[PDB]
């Protein structure tokens with residue numbers, strides 16, 4: 001044989017203990033770790049289907065919707081976003097994009113690649129979107145879909161949602177909202193706020209492992225997707241196939257792909273946990289924790305990047321990089337000396353911020369103390 | 385709130401004990417179950433990268449290649465196939481497809497959706513491809529890529545590979561081979577047999593959980609992908625991004641998507657296991673087990689669908705449905721009475737066969753006895 005057994009693979013796997021307090025992913029509670037260690041069942045068994053049904057009721061609970069076209073995407077954040085755009089937007093269609101952070105910029109890049117006409121409302125890191133600025137774009141471009149980042153995890157901004165669905169619907173437009181970094185950590189009502197496509201990721205405030213995502217489509221969305229001239233560029237993400245398998249339509253579930261069974265075990269449990277807590281409890285926890293953290297960081301003499309407290313994402317706090325420090329020094333000092341993961345910026349916010357993450361079980365005063373103690377020592381030990 | 389906590393989510397998760405002896409997925413050994421229950425690390429940490437490096441050496445070992453453009457796809461089988469086709473085939477390009485089973489038919493459907501000219505060499509269930517039939521197509525259509533199903537898990541056929549790479553290369557063509565149902569269970573040498581794109585799935589003979597896949601690209605493939613006029617229709621599967629992150633190129637690893645960390649733990653271990661066994665041992669085990677099973681099924685008076693024993697896939701055995709039975713009766717009887725999953729057909733083979741799966745740790749005489757005992761009782765108890 002050409003290749004011989006890799007010598008590094010012949011030692012036993014060993015992973016460190018890290019406290020993950022960056023934008024994502026998050027640490028796992030015991031129940032979700034327990035689910036990840038279970039044995040396999042038939043990917044198309046009665047028992048697997050029952051689990052998928054329970055997961056759907058769960059996504060309906062956290063999204064606050066009754067859309068029967070609700071299901072899990074076998075992929076990360078990007079994969080739910082991509083599934084949204086490749087099933088909704090045909091080549092030529094007009095797409096209006098709130099590019100307030102990396103997430104809008106990505107939604108742009110996808111849009112361009114599948115041949116949409118892409119209308120970028122660039123706002124500098126920290127900025128948000130006013131209903132009028134939306135209708136001024138809506139008037140200028142007459143799009144079929146508006147993408148809005150709810151929890152902008154690259155800028156620590158909480159986008160206001162109220163009204164925008166009723167605005168978009170007047171102009172015949174569809175509302176797509178990125179709630180990957182917001183779901184479970186701030187108020188969100190899909191049906192009530194008139195959202196057409198809502199997606200979220202497992203690895204954020206739900207505390208499940210990365211590589212699944214949540215998506216729900218309103219009836220209006222469903223129509224646009226179920227009366228395309230062409231087929232979507234993706235077969236893996238084709239909604240008509242996915243919808244069928246997950247049991248959304250009238251036809252019996254036909255084999256599309258193989259779903260990530262053990263991940264669905266974990267995701268199920270993550271949804272059972274926030275079910276047991278209750279949504280408004282979870283929003284309380286994250287709102288208070290966030291409040292505490294900004295207090296402590298303010299004491300250290302650090303500055304919160306988002307100045308208006310009504311626009312600060314509870315789940316991901318941006319902190320202006322203190323003048324005269326190498327951000328990478330701080331970030332490295334923290335993990336090295338305290339085994340805590342924090343991040344720098346991302347996209348427009350690259351170099352400008354530090355990012356701190358409070359997500360689900362991880363959103364405790366304990367962890368805020370820890371990250372504040374760690375940032376203390378770093379600030380007085382990193383060169384100036 | 386609109387929706388209240390689902391009452392089914394408020395009971396504790398419980399899953400049955402099934403022996404999975406269908407085409408896929410397979411049961412997990414203890415080490416892979418142990419890995420799935422571990423705690424999370426930073427998705428972009430030094431430690432996560434070291435694991436990804438070890439997984440790459442592993443895919444190089446089982447694929448038998450030194451292609452430095454080798455990596456995991458964050459998706460199932462279809463996702464590796466789709467990633468192959470959307471990065472290699474530009475709209476208009478000529479694509480020659482060995483449609484001997486469902487897998488070719490799917491490769492067709494993808495091909496059509498991304499705007500390739502799709503040349504379907506339909507052969508009836510059980511058939512394979514002769515080097516001449518390939519060069520007669522190669523002469524007729526002058527394709528940029530030929531897709532060949534190695535282990536045709538819908539028909540139980542083992543496609544001969546030897547020569548075809550040297551054939552395709554003469555015509556400037558690229559060879560793409562679907563080794564999802566063959567890797568680890570029959571001889572396969574990527575470099576030596578001159579394969580340009582080879583992919584496989586985790587949930588088959590490697591005994592890892594579904595939702596990752598393995599892919600490797602030769603230099604020739606790399607060139608075609610790294611000199612496209614257009615961008616691929618997919619951002620999630622864009623090879624230039626994936627290659628970078630996984631550490632294949634010269635640039636430092638930039639954030640694309642979040643990789644399924646806990647799955648990569650499991651996949652790593654699945655590769656460490658077949659590393660410890662050794663490839664030719666694993667091929668021995670599956671060849672013998674397969675041999676035993678055909679003996680036992682022959683005794684029950686059942687007929688093997690693939691008549692030439694040199695063309696029978698060791699990992700997935702097709703069995704002609706016995707005259708005068710409802711296949712679904714047998715399949716249902718087996719799971720109900722013996723807790724064993726077997727399958728019927730799929731695509732062209734739908735209704736025509738029963739499928740039995742011997743994959744990795746599951747490919748033992750014990751399990752062949754069990755499935756043979758179970759099929760015994762079914763045959764004498766199902767109506768005629």
Ligand SMILES: Cc1ncc(COP(=O)(O)O)c(CN)c1O
Pocket residue numbers: 023024076077078079103151152153178179180181201204210211640641642
């Ligand atoms: C707001 C937001 N948008 C998009 C993503 C992308 O998720 P993934 O990298 O898992 O695809 C994330 C996850 N960090 C996110 O928080």
Ligand SMILES: Cc1ncc(COP(=O)(O)O)c(CN)c1O
Pocket residue numbers: 256257258407408460461462463487535536537562563564565585588594595
């Ligand atoms: C030969 C073959 N091709 C394709 C696939 C598709 O794999 P998945 O459903 O995990 O995408 C499989 C898995 N059963 C396979 O065995």
